[PDB]
Design a protein around this ligand. Structure first.
Ligand SMILES: Cc1nc2ccccc2n1CCC(N)=O
Length: 119
């Protein structure tokens, strides 16, 4: 029932994500010199360094907000990919599966703790 436990749990999951080779295309903002039309397709860029910095600044109130930004990294990759078989998009799908598998208990524990707080 610890309402604050999600933050360190998210920090540890982000550390695992940064160790994953599949996260390399998503660690830093997409470079416009490499992908000149990126901002014609993607309105809201997101990357794992931005998520980590937002968490560390104390700018997430809940793990749901962090989850929304991580999911935006994956939806941006899906929207930008020229093919559903592209290398970077394929890496995004594996990384998304790994993230969803691990974030599930973080979200459940937070929501349960909050329900207990408001009982
Ligand atoms: C984030 C992303 N998703 C893509 C899907 C397909 C092709 C490129 C893609 N990028 C950019 C890779 C980078 N510039 O770091």
């Amino acid at each position: 029932y610890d309402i604050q436990a999600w933050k360190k749990q998210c920090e540890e999951l982000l550390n695992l994500i940064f160790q994953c080779e599949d996260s390399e295309p998503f660690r830093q903002p997409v470079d416009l010199l490499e992908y000149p039309d990126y901002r014609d397709i993607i309105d809201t860029p997101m990357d794992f360094a931005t998520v980590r910095e937002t968490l560390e600044a104390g700018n997430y109130e809940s793990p749901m907000e962090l989850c929304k930004d991580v999911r935006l990294i994956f939806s941006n990759s899906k929207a930008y990919t020229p093919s559903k078989r592209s290398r970077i998009y394929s890496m995004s799908l594996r990384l998304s599966a790994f993230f969803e598998e691990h974030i599930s208990s973080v979200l459940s524990d937070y929501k349960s703790a909050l329900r207990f707080h408001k009982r």
